[PDB]
Amino acid sequence: APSRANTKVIVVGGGGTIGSSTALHLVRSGYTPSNVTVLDAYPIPSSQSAGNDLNKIMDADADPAADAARQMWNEDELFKKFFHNTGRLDCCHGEKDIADCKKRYQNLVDWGLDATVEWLDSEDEILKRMPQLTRDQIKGWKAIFSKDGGWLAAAKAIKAIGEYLRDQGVRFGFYGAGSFKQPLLAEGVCIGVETVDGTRYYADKVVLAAGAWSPTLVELQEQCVSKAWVYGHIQLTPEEAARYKNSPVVYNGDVGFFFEPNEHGIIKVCDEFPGFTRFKMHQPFGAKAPKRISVPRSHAKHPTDTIPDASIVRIRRAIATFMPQFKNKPLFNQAMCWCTDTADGHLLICEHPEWKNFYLATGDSGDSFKLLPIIGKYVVELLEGTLADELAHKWRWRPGSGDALKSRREAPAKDLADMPGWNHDH
Numbered sequence: 001a002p003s004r005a006n007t008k009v010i011v012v013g014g015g016g017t018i019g020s021s022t023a024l025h026l027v028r029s030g031y032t033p034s035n036v037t038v039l040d041a042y043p044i045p046s047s048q049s050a051g052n053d054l055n056k057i058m059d060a061d062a063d064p065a066a067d068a069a070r071q072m073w074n075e076d077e078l079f080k081k082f083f084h085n086t087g088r089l090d091c092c093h094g095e096k097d098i099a100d101c102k103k104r105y106q107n108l109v110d111w112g113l114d115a116t117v118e119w120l121d122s123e124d125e126i127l128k129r130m131p132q133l134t135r136d137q138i139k140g141w142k143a144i145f146s147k148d149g150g151w152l153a154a155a156k157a158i159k160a161i162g163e164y165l166r167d168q169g170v171r172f173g174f175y176g177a178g179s180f181k182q183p184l185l186a187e188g189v190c191i192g193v194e195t196v197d198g199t200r201y202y203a204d205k206v207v208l209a210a211g212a213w214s215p216t217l218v219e220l221q222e223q224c225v226s227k228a229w230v231y232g233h234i235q236l237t238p239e240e241a242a243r244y245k246n247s248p249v250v251y252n253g254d255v256g257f258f259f260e261p262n263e264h265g266i267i268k269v270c271d272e273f274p275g276f277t278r279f280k281m282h283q284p285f286g287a288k289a290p291k292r293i294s295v296p297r298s299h300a301k302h303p304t305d306t307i308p309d310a311s312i313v314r315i316r317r318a319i320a321t322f323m324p325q326f327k328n329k330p331l332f333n334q335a336m337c338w339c340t341d342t343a344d345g346h347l348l349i350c351e352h353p354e355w356k357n358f359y360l361a362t363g364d365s366g367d368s369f370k371l372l373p374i375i376g377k378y379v380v381e382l383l384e385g386t387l388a389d390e391l392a393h394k395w396r397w398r399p400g401s402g403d404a405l406k407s408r409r410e411a412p413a414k415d416l417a418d419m420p421g422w423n424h425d426h
């Protein structure tokens with residue numbers, strides 16, 4: 001095994017979240033930049049990466065990886081500017097959701113103290129916190145307000161990683177030169193990657209950080225099932241947008257959520273739901289025949305795609321509830337954004353059980369963007385044989401460990417074949 005300075009690594013999906021972090025941590029660890037090759041279907045930040053977004057939520061997860069990430073969002077100079085500490089307003093209505101939120105709030109008063117969390121026990125208490133809401137839309141609502149967390153400028157953070165890597169001299173391959181087709185195996189040892197255009201890249205170690213595409217590219221035995229979530233955007237005038245400067249993330253699990261406007265006055269609005277699959281026949285490397293698996297329907301490949309009609313209705317209901325004064329604004333740049341769920345919702349970060357020096361770094365399960373600053377550190381540890389055993393176990397190769405179609409969500413994902421309104425191919 002060579003020294004870090006002499007080790008060649010290929011990061012497949014290095015234009016995405018986990019992949020770009022991996023490349024960053026290899027460089028920060030003293031790998032020689034020109035020995036690191038980032039391969040992606042699309043140039044960093046990849047136009048189909050789940051992290052290519054105006055915003056993501058940063059919550060207050062006590063988990064060690066989430067904690068370490070939070071410290072870097074606060075303190076690391078590459079990342080800090082992209083974390084917006086607006087807090088979060090979690091709204092609840094109906095007996096069931098209110099009971100759940102009260103229990104959750106009590107757990108904070110119990111477990112690791114409250115401190116930065118408030119209970120809002122009426123409409124008027126919510127309005128004092130967020131005067132931009134409309135009373136007649138929030139009848140019977142209560143809320144938890146958390147001063148911790150807020151939102152992350154996701155595409156900008158990945159873009160900042162790519163500029164850093166570029167300036168260090170990392171090597172890149174994109175499009176046909178970056179789209180993984182197969183590992184290169186020599187008697188059960190991975191020694192590189194071949195791309196769609198026929199280019200062959202050789203390295204000591206290969207990381208597959210291909211997000212929702214990972215189970216399409218190599219045989220993962222249904223350990224990961226790929227699903228889409230949805231959003232769209234509305235455009236506020238400068239005067240309208242000023243009202244929502246530093247506004248908290250607003251969330252109601254029965255409705256959806258929205259963010260503070262970006263610097264161009266655009267609000268992104270999301271639904272809350274268990275995700276959509278898109279099953280079709282496909283043959284990943286390592287599969288003996290085509291199989292029915294959920295294959296992302298990429299908005300980058302298909303920019304005329306929007307989102308299902310059902311989704312538009314839900315997002316319109318969210319705007320009508322949270323921002324009734326903006327109900328006549330067009331919802332634009334509608335898109336589907338893909339992730340991959342494991343059965344238990346933990347990551348899949350492990351060496352392949354048959355292909356030595358080929359490593360999986362996926363299973364993001366819809367809540368990994370917030371790990372961008374830290375996650376590559378754990379991937380480097382895996383490559384070097386130093387990942388903490390409890391994490392190695394939690395993130396292990398585990399086919400047959402449960403049904404990832406439902407995962408730890410409320411319901412099995414429905415399928416885009418059954419959800420009209422997104423496809424505008426003709």
Ligand SMILES: *Cc1cc2c(cc1C)nc1c(=O)[nH]c(=O)nc-1n2C[C@H](O)[C@H](O)[C@H](O)COP(=O)(O)OP(=O)(O)OC[C@H]1O[C@@H](n2cnc3c(N)ncnc32)[C@H](O)[C@@H]1O
Nearest residue numbers: 013016017018041046050057180210211337364368369370
């Ligand atoms: C979709 C989504 C996700 C999301 C979210 C809202 C939506 C609508 N809200 C979040 C939130 O509030 N907080 C949070 O922490 N996470 C949230 N998420 C999830 C998050 O976006 C994902 O968990 C995370 O971004 C996933 O990272 P991962 O690195 O696994 O995936 P990726 O960024 O999509 O990157 C994968 C890359 O692989 C490349 N690719 C695909 N095929 C190939 C081939 N053949 N060859 C080479 N590269 C390939 C992609 O192009 C991509 O760059």
